Chains A and B, each alone.
Chain A
Amino acid sequence: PRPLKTTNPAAMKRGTGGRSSFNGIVATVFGATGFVGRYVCNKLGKSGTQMILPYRGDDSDVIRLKVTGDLGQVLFHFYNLEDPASIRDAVKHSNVVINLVGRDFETKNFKFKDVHVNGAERIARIAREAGVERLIHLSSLNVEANPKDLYVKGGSEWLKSKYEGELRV
């Protein structure tokens, strides 16, 4: 018997399943401006899920996601990955946190460890401290503890970073 958290009858599941309905899920899709984020935002908005949607860059890269949900089901929030208080402000009223934060190349501000390892662990521990019921995190298929190079030297840092980030999550 799985118990309910708050039993607020303005917060339970209602409706048939369109945009105007509510399925009792408050999603916080981190990195929702990306490739998987667009499809998961439209799939969440077609069912009636309110999304908080924290964005890091400009508002023009994230303002296209207002057409996925209904009125009031789409929010926006400015955050940095190194800043923990903004993440705690983002996930303080949520029960489902979806983590799509990842980067295929090293950046001058964020390395692989600063995105996949440290950032996902920080998001997971902030969501655990904020009372989030469920967290969804994405990794790679071929993650190993010590993955070997095949063609390029210095490769498979991404797979090791995703495996270490999954272990810290």
Chain B
Amino acid sequence: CRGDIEKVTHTGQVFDKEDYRNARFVNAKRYVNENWGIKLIEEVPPKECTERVVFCDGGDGPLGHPKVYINLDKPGNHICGYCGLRFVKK
């Protein structure tokens, strides 16, 4: 048996056993990325900040995403819409 056919991707897609389109994988490997972004962005801890508004750059200046400012007045974790890093105010 081959375990690379029924394995789901990060987009929630899998060919079921009654599908005709699994005949393309009888001679070739189905490429599924094992590095999902959801677990790899849930693995990092949130960043604690004291000021009301913060900025997220995503890394280096010219090599990161465009600069955004996040307001941390609401309690909870605020997620940057570009990189996915979470900020929190104490």
Which residues of A come within 8 Å of B, CB atoms? 5-6, 8, 10-11, 26, 50, 52, 72, 75-77, 89-90, 92-95
Contact = CB atoms under 8 A, between A and B. Distances in A.
* Cβ-closest 3 pairs across A and B: A93-B23, A6-B18, A26-B20
Contact of B23 (A5, A6, A10, A26): A26
Nearest to B16: A8
B24 interface: yes
A93 B27 contact: no
Interface size bucket, B side?
A: under 10
A75 B18 CA distance: 18
Interface string B1-37: 0000000000000000011111110110000000000
Contacts, number: 36
A10 B27 contact: no
B23 to A, nearest CB: 4
Contacts of A77: 26-27
A127 to B, nearest CB: 14
Contacts of B22: 93
30 contacts: A5-B18, A6-B18, A6-B19, A8-B18, A8-B20, A10-B19, A10-B21, A11-B19, A11-B20, A11-B21, A26-B23, A50-B23, A72-B24, A75-B23, A75-B26, A75-B27, A76-B27, A77-B26, A89-B26, A90-B26, A92-B23, A92-B26, A93-B19, A93-B20, A93-B22, A93-B23, A93-B26, A94-B20, A94-B23, A95-B20
